[PDB]
């Protein structure tokens, strides 16, 4: 009868669908590797999908996945054990070296663009007609790290132009130079901006950007990476 045909067909459609979905989710990170960089023996039960090409939009190129994979960067870690499956110790300073929760990826060293081709993120000062509309305005507030020591002062907000959203605080140090802190990692309060991830002495270590009115995807990854890493790696200096 119809209903048991429909149900049986459906479990077949459903297994085909899980197959499609699982292979589609193999377009990044595959083929699997041994801890040493080498293709692993056991690739799992699903084959790689036939590749596909995204056309990027501002003469920015193509992406074709799956494709050859690589960190395009040195990984300062080493084995701590004699077989598969254990942690890999930082061979240096893990914050400086961009590993563990301080990791960053070798994203493209241009800025993300809006639909019109302009830089997506600008310091508010260069963003025409953009002003704070609600909430404590943090500009001018001292910035305090997890040691409860003051690390600098907020000197602008970097805003996403097409989505009208705060993305970073630009913070000035004793130095005179500035750093970006991710908006999602600061707490804005009446008389200060509080940063739990970092202690005051780790502010100078925040990756710097090359031009003062642009950030590249590569630069965002290093900054977000480094301050996220502080949660684990700043923990001895954290009151």
């Amino acid at each position: 009868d119809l209903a048991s045909l429909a149900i049986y067909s459906f479990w077949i459609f459903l297994a085909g669908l899980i197959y499609y979905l699982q292979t589609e989710n193999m377009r990044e990170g595959y083929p699997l590797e041994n801890e040493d960089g080498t293709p692993a023996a056991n690739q799992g039960p699903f084959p790689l999908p036939k590749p596909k090409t995204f056309i990027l939009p501002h003469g920015r190129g193509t992406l074709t996945v799956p494709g050859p994979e690589s960190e395009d960067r040195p990984i300062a870690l080493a084995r701590t054990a004699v077989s598969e499956g254990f942690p890999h110790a930082p061979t240096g300073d893990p914050m400086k070296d961009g590993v563990g929760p301080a990791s960053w990826v070798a994203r493209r060293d241009l800025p993300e663009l809006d639909g019109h081709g302009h830089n997506k993120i600008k310091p508010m000062k260069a963003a025409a007609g953009f002003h704070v509309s609600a909430g404590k305005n943090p500009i001018g507030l001292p910035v305090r790290g997890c040691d409860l020591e003051i690390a600098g002062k907020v000197v602008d907000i970097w805003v996403d132009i097409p989505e009208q959203m705060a993305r970073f605080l630009e913070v000035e140090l004793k130095d005179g130079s500035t750093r970006l802190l991710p908006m999602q990692m600061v707490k804005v309060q009446s008389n200060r901006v509080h940063v739990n991830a970092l202690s005051s002495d780790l502010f100078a270590g925040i990756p710097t950007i090359k031009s003062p009115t642009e950030v590249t995807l590569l630069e965002e990854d290093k900054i977000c990476g480094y301050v996220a890493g502080g949660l684990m790696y700043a923990a001895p200096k954290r009151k």
């Binding site: 990170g29 041994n34 939009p57 598969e84 499956g85 990791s103």
Partner: protein, 281 residues
């Protein structure tokens, strides 16, 4: 055994209990202390369910079913074969879930991400504990809890619902269903938006969030935005589960008559109770 970008994240640290003792992976899987806890509770429970399966005399999983103590036991223990196995499996289940969440917390700390995933999972655990622990305790017996079997737990859903007429009339249940449906709405829209930007018309180039905002504004006059929709999905989800727990925590406890009749508070309000016409006059 590793995704091509995985090695750099696989560092020591993050753990909540045990320093570096269980700090390692098996294949793709992290292992908490809470990985070990999760295995112990899960395994014990599965054994105890396989055992419950033989004392009830079946091996097919559409029939296997483990019942709570009958009402007569109140909140007391009960022998293994007559609902104690259930009691212990329930302790194991709680053990395995709470463990799983806490393992999730460990993974979070190692990866330097926020706690949102385990926090969210905690709502599901609370829904479960509302059915098997909080509601029973407030009602005086394990026997009100639902049993562990594929088709038998549905039986319990019917019997519990129909003890109050059409359960539709539970107003907290109405709100809960609202959030489930809305959630699925948002989930369909969210997936289709992102995908329709990433896979445009053909030969055409990837669209942008600006396009996604533009499409939504064109269509309904408003777009919540790429941050918003993720806040939203999270909130609709969790809200659905919250109101699910609410609609059941209040059932058999503060309200125990037919849910349809609760609505009479509205109709019998002074200023219109006795006016004639309409359905209730």
């Amino acid at each position: 055994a590793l995704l091509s970008f995985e090695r750099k994240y696989r560092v020591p640290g993050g753990t909540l209990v045990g320093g570096n003792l269980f700090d390692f992976w098996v294949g793709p899987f992290y292992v908490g202390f809470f990985g070990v806890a999760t295995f112990f509770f899960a395994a014990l429970g599965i054994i105890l369910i396989a055992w419950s399966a033989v004392l009830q005399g079946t091996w097919n999983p559409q029939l296997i079913s483990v019942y709570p103590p009958a009402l007569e036991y109140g909140l007391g223990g009960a022998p293994l074969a007559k609902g104690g196995l259930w009691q212990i499996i329930t302790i194991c289940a709680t053990g395995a879930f709470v463990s799983w969440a806490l393992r999730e917390v460990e993974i979070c700390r190692k990866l330097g991400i926020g706690y949102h995933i385990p926090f969210a999972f905690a709502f599901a655990i609370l829904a479960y504990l509302t059915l098997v622990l909080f509601r029973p305790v407030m009602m005086g017996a394990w026997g009100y809890a639902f049993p562990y079997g594929i088709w038998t737990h549905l039986d319990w859903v019917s019997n519990t619902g129909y003890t109050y007429g059409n359960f539709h009339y539970n107003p907290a249940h109405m709100i809960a269903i609202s959030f489930f449906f809305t959630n699925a709405l948002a989930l369909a829209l969210h997936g289709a938006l992102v995908l329709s930007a990433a896979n445009p018309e053909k030969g055409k180039e990837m669209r942008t969030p600006d396009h996604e905002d533009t499409f939504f504004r064109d269509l309904v006059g408003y777009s919540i935005g790429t941050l918003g929709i993720h806040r939203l999905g999270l909130l609709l989800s969790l809200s659905a589960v919250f109101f699910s727990a609410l609609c059941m925590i209040i059932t058999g406890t503060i309200w125990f008559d037919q849910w349809v009749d609760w609505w009479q508070w509205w109709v019998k309000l002074p200023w219109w109770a006795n006016i004639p016409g309409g359905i209730n006059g």
